[PDB]
């Protein structure tokens, strides 16, 4: 195809459509909605915008996502602590952190860890430190360590602290070794101190679920992963990823 | 999720053809109730806690066994969870009303609701009764015209549960 011919065609359609409207605001709106086409074809003078690549460990596959696929509006709003925000959005980020770690806002039960909230709002500890201390707290041990065997604890901790399902037999193997050896604190420390957490979230960003549209999705754990990214995931007590990767 | 606009756009995009008379009729019907639905959404967003109060009062007056010992709502934790679920239902019904589509309900409430309540032992019929009480209270609060628009999605949730 000829790109110049397409630009001429879109400009001609812009002129024709603007002709019929006979209203200045209408004309400017439709002209903008055609100028977006001209602007995009002009912007793609170099190659198409780079495709987003999710890195992986030698155990699981590395995946790529087209830049077109991500920017459809489904991108999650990342919650970040600037240490200088007003107390309203500070509390907003704190509530988001509680929702992510505990799968729901447990302030509906009046349950919170006040000193950790004060520390994360003041800036003594970062959001990563807050997440790690929140995951090894007494509350998290109650909702997500006691009712479960170590394998399901592993899977739910993956969901809560990395925002994704386990993707390899090696991964569940290593983190089961870590949990079996060191308990909940060791498991949370391994999850949060890893390179993937720092790369995806960093110090100041609350973890989020990295489901469809956010990044490239593995195919080998699709059904199990989207069973896990569901508020009914704690309702299942049988582990599902060790079993899957063994099967 | 989807709304009425996305549904029509996709319906005519898969066919590959412009909007016909039925399409414009659907969009006009959706836009006509838009201001009424936004007013109702503002009322609900402003007075959600009140609606929860009367809905829970009616539910637990009609079924006192729920909050007496041996009932699923008997503890402070389980009572708080019950009223929290009711707030969930009200908020997602408001979302569905503003969207005009029940896709958000299927996606983010019904997907896993039955598993949750059968695992936890929550009585589904009593939850339906609580949703109906919430419907009545919110309809009394937001007016009959917006009451019908609330009630369609409240009925969608109730039929999803039972």
């Amino acid at each position: 195809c000829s790109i110049d011919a397409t630009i001429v065609a879109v400009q001609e359609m812009r002129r024709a459509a603007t002709g019929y409207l006979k209203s200045n605001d209408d004309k400017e709106l439709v002209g903008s909605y055609f100028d977006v086409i001209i602007r995009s074809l002009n912007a793609d003078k170099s190659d198409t915008p780079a495709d987003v690549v999710r890195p992986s460990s030698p155990d699981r596959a590395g995946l790529v996502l087209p830049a077109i696929y991500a920017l459809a509006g489904q991108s999650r709003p990342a919650f970040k602590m600037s240490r200088t925000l007003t107390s309203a959005e500070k509390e907003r980020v704190v509530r988001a952190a509680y929702r992510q770690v505990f799968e729901r806002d447990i302030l509906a039960y009046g349950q919170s860890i006040s000193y950790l909230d004060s520390k994360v709002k003041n800036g003594e500890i970062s959001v990563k430190e807050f997440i790690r201390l929140l995951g090894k707290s007494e509350l998290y041990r109650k909702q997500f360590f006691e009712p479960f065997i170590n394998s399901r604890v592993l899977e739910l901790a993956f969901k809560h602290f990395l925002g994704r399902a386990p993707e390899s037999r090696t991964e569940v193997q290593n983190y089961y070794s870590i949990v079996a050896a060191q308990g909940l604190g060791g498991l949370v420390d391994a999850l949060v101190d890893g390179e993937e957490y720092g790369r995806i979230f960093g110090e100041d960003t609350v973890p989020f679920i990295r489901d469809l549209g956010q990044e490239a999705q593995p195919s080998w754990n699709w059904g199990a992963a989207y069973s896990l990214y569901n508020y009914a995931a704690p309702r299942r007590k049988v582990p599902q990823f060790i079993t899957l990767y063994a099967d | 999720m989807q709304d009425a606009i996305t549904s029509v756009i996709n319906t005519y995009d898969v066919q590959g053809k412009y909007f016909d008379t039925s399409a414009f009729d659907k969009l006009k019907a959706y836009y006509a109730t838009g201001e009424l639905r936004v007013r109702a959404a503002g009322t609900i967003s402003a007075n959600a806690a009140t609606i929860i109060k009367e809905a829970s009062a009616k539910l637990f007056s009609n079924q006192p066994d729920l909050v007496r010992p041996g009932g699923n709502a008997y503890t402070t934790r389980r009572y708080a969870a019950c009223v929290r679920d009711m707030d969930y239902f009200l908020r997602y019904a408001t979302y569905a009303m503003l969207a005009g589509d029940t896709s958000i309900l299927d996606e983010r409430v019904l997907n896993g609701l039955k598993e949750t309540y059968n695992s936890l032992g929550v009585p589904i019929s009593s939850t339906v009764q609580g949703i109906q009480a919430m419907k009545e209270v919110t309809g009394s609060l937001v007016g009959s015209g917006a009451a019908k628009e609330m009630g369609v999605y409240f009925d969608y949730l109730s039929s999803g549960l039972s």
Binding site: A9, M13, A16, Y20, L21, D26, L29 | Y18, F24
Partner: peptide, 27 residues
């Protein structure tokens, strides 16, 4: 409502605009 009126005007004249562009650039 204004945007829907715009859409109605454009869809009534869709074939005209498409054929006009096609004639402008082709043959």
């Amino acid at each position: 409502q204004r945007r829907l009126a715009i859409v109605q005007i454009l869809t009534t004249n869709a074939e005209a605009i498409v054929s006009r562009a096609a004639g402008r650039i082709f043959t």
